[PDB]
Glutamate receptor ionotropic, delta-2
Amino acid sequence: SLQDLSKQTEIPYGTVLDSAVYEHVRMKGLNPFERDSMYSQMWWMINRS
Amino acid sequence: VADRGYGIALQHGSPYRDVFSQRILELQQNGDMDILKHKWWPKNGQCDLYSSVDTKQKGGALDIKSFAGVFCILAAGIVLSCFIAMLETWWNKRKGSR
């Protein structure tokens, strides 16, 4: 499940840079009103450096 | 445990009371407030502050330090045998014999 993938420790994950997926994740993780641990810990991993 | 919150205090009946509230709503709705918060509580974390599960270890072999109590019991046995052997080393003179 994505609840696993966004939180599991072993496997790094990401997508195509600047893509509408990358932006879809950013727009969920840094959302003002959606605030879930899930999309946040997605974006923290994805946005590294 | 939300809905508690911080705010500017003013004297009773101050003519500014509605003016600052009006401006604070505009800042809250323009997004101008969100910038300052991202500035001061950035999520560009130099470390992960939130995953409490340290990643590398999920069980692990025993080691000298976790085992050390048994070595300490053995060392106590050694030292007690030394104390006994030194008492014997003195007393066997009085025994004059094996």
